[PDB]
From a paper:
Acetylcholine-binding protein is a highly conserved ortholog of the pLGIC extracellular ligand-binding domain (ECD) with properties similar to nAChR.
The residues now changed (Thr53, Gln74, Tyr110, Ile135 and Gly162) correspond to Phe72, Arg93, Ala146, Ser157 and Glu202 in the human GlyR-α1(−)/β(+) orthosteric site [Figs. 1(b) and 2]. Crystal structures of variant II with HEPES, tropisetron and strychnine revealed that the G162E substitution was accommodated with the structure essentially unperturbed compared with variant I, although now incorporating two charged residues (Arg74 and Glu162) to polarize the binding site such that the principal side is negatively charged and the complementary side is positive. The complex structure with HEPES showed this crystallization buffer component binding in two orientations in the orthosteric site in a similar fashion to that reported for LsAChBP.
Author numbering:
A (entry chain D), D (entry chain B): 20 to 224
B (entry chain E): 20 to 226
C (entry chain A), E (entry chain C): 20 to 225
Write the structure that this text describes.
Amino acid sequence: QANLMRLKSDLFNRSPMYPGPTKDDPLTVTLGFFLQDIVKVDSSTNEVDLVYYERQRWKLNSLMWDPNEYGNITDFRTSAADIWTPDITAASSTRPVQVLSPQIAVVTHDGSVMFSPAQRLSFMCDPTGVDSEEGVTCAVKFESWVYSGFEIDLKTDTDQVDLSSYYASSKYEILSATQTRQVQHYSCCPEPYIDVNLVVKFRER
Amino acid sequence: QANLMRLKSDLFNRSPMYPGPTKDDPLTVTLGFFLQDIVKVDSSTNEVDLVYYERQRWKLNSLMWDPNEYGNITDFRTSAADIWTPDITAASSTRPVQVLSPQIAVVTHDGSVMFSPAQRLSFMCDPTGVDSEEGVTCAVKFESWVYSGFEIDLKTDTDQVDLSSYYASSKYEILSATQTRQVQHYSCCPEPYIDVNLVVKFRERRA
Amino acid sequence: QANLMRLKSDLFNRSPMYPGPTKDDPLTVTLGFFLQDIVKVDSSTNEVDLVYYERQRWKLNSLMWDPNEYGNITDFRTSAADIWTPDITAASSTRPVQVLSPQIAVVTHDGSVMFSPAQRLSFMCDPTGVDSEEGVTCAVKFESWVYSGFEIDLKTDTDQVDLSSYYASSKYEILSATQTRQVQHYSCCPEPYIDVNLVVKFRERR
Amino acid sequence: QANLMRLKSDLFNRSPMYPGPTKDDPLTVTLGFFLQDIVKVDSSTNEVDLVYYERQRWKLNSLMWDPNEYGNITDFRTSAADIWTPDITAASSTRPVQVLSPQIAVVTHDGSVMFSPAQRLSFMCDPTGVDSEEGVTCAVKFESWVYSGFEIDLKTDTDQVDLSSYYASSKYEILSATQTRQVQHYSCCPEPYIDVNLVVKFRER
Amino acid sequence: QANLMRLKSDLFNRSPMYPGPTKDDPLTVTLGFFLQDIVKVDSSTNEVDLVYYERQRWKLNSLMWDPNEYGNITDFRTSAADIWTPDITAASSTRPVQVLSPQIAVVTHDGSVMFSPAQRLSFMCDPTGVDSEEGVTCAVKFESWVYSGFEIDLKTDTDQVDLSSYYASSKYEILSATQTRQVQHYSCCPEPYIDVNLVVKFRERR
Ligand SMILES: *[C@@H]1O[C@H](CO)[C@@H](O)[C@H](O)[C@H]1NC(C)=O
Ligand SMILES: *[C@@H]1O[C@H](CO)[C@@H](O)[C@H](O)[C@H]1NC(C)=O
Ligand SMILES: *[C@@H]1O[C@H](CO)[C@@H](O)[C@H](O)[C@H]1NC(C)=O
Ligand SMILES: *[C@@H]1O[C@H](CO)[C@@H](O)[C@H](O)[C@H]1NC(C)=O
């Protein structure tokens, strides 16, 4: 405990918080989605509600340490308020995101940070054809609200959405679920626009 | 990072927050609306729900810096809790406005601030005629709740509401959407208020 | 800005907040209601929902200043958390009051404070007869939860509720809306309370 | 106001907050209920919703003063955040208690504190027979969540629930309403566990 | 009171909060469930709502004291904000867990902490067959969100789900209720991931 207290003090009390990336010092953030349940579908309003968690990872040199100097501690957990976190947002949400997990992150000795908030999300989606055999396809884009592709680069570690925690007796069954980095370039402008597109194909079970 | 950390420390940790405008030192705020979706319409209660984001811009001398003194940094991002933001409110909302985006602002070296919160709003609107070809018109005023036109002047950069992010498979299609500066006098108060009136003409999509 | 920063520092950082009125130093608070919309009516539960804002005004000597000493500043805006505010409550609400406006007050150099929160309120009311020509009457009392009439006196400046912000195409139309100072007696206590009774007569816009 | 400011400063700024009762220094808390309205009854979920206010009184030597030393002030009002308050809870609530009044208490010079929060409560109750002439009886227990009867003794000042503020045009009428202290002793342990049982008999009007 | 005030000051004001367990200094946390009511069932969305309380126990050397030095105080109560608490979460909730009790823990002189929050939970469960004699079976997993089995070793304090506080006139009756630790190992990683699985068999009471 003494070792961890000394480590947290050295990281958080001495130096200030990471102020965020700039064009000179950009930051890669990796996203992965873990789908738990398609809870409901509203054809009256074209809204769908998803429960999932979202693994976010980035790496900062200011959060590095030598385990030997701190009783061989290789990682620790801390409140997400104690560190900078990225502003990743669902671009087409229709209600505030409801947080289902504690807001706590894992920091490892190489300066890697992992933050995995569980969420209930309502987003825009026309569910006509969900009651058929072919099903329906909906998509939602995740992006940094205020950082361009020159400051925050988004990527995924895999293209497959993890369905290992997907509830077997959900009202809706998953035909397909992918997560894909998309880069948009406009003729006008030099900076790319980056998003991660979550595409889910599903139908009534 | 060192340069940005020093800059944020100089701006936020040394000086206090901007205390808001006065009659001697008024402030112009520019508003632009970006409509995403008319989510629902309730004829039983005459309430309509809109999803949109709202670009707010203002300029403060207290947030200025010289890029040369901070490694040529021309701008940065910060939590909206770190700065004063204006008290712009929908005057006819029926439920508290729900925030859909992170509360983060962009500050540039000339002291300009840009803050663009995404929002879900329920407001008063009679939707009779939405199922027709002519559609229905609703209006909602946005204004400072407590600053008169002598302290906060509102403007728009354009009169056309941006529909580029509008959801193609919405139940409702937009016939027209304008944003217009107005001057209001209220029974409460002798000082006039400035509002931006968002007027949207829409109907059920025949799809 | 320098002048306003110095003023706010002199008022809020040096002295403590006003601790509230006592029997020796009572306080008058003026209330006006501005009705916006009767949003819904629930006959299954006898609940009605109102959207309105409530203008509250009082005066404190501890919030006075000389404009000459502060660049001719005659007033300013500040978070309602920075000042004492009165504990005015709807006595017959059935749900917590939902706040629709920022919690910000106007303070003027004579020590006058104006605080005007916009609110959605659910309160107890039997709406039988709302679909008729005569309509229905509902009433809700606003009062200090813990200060008697010897500490907080409530008044209104007018007996007519302001309907200038009332939504023209509301499902419900207003036949009458008054705001009236009363004295309220509780079994518990010998001291009377002052309330403002908001009485609204309305019907379906047929 | 100078006298009241000095008094509040002497009580709250100098000493810390009362840390709660112990077995050596127990505390009596008195509870009284004032019923305003039975708002709804849900037979689909066996939930009933009540609006009421709850008078809580206790007495602390740490909140005593001599009126002569403070301009003859015999009492004052203060935010409930400035003082310790008891952890009285409805044991059979089905939703978080919703607070309908400002969180403010009255403190008197003998160290008595009165705190009377207005509340909307959903609690477990089977309302079968509410539409009959006999009506239906429901009960809800109030207790300290973490203090045993050796630390907090609960009592009522009367056994009759005050119905003087009960809404005349409620959908439901009250046939009877009592509030009664109950003590439970367990084989395991020496300490008694105390609750106040609020029993309400009612029917459709 | 003086003794308890001095104790709380020595524990909380001098030292910082316990920063959480590590691989070098792991922590055992016990969970036990006390089921109060199955409030509702939604077959349209396959959601069920449960009211229960959850007894959590762990032990820390940083919260130890000698009763002789503090007027023979063997235990006290404190706000859960004053201490580290474990990050136990329902992994299959569909809405944020609603807290029904005050957030207060019991700390004893050997450094044992007991924290028992009451909660309303909506979780994923297909209730087809709840209206039958056989009933329906649902499960909900509880786990530390961010601590592996190398940091928090999570277990049950008892083998029985306590049904003694279960409401007799609930719409639903409990046929069976178990609580069980489960361990998962992944190809990626050496550390085990632990959950406690609450399995409840129930049906409509008629
Ligand atoms: C430090 O921990 C690592 C991780 O398991 C292990 O390989 C090593 O044996 C430990 N070293 C010491 C000095 O304890
Ligand atoms: C800032 O810009 C000037 C001119 O382009 C350049 O010489 C200088 O190296 C820059 N300063 C830093 C610290 O990068
Ligand atoms: C503004 O300040 C100057 C300071 O000398 C004073 O002469 C003047 O009277 C003030 N304005 C008003 C309207 O009082
Ligand atoms: C602690 O216990 C001793 C007996 O061993 C007793 O005499 C003493 O009074 C106790 N202390 C307090 C403060 O009660």
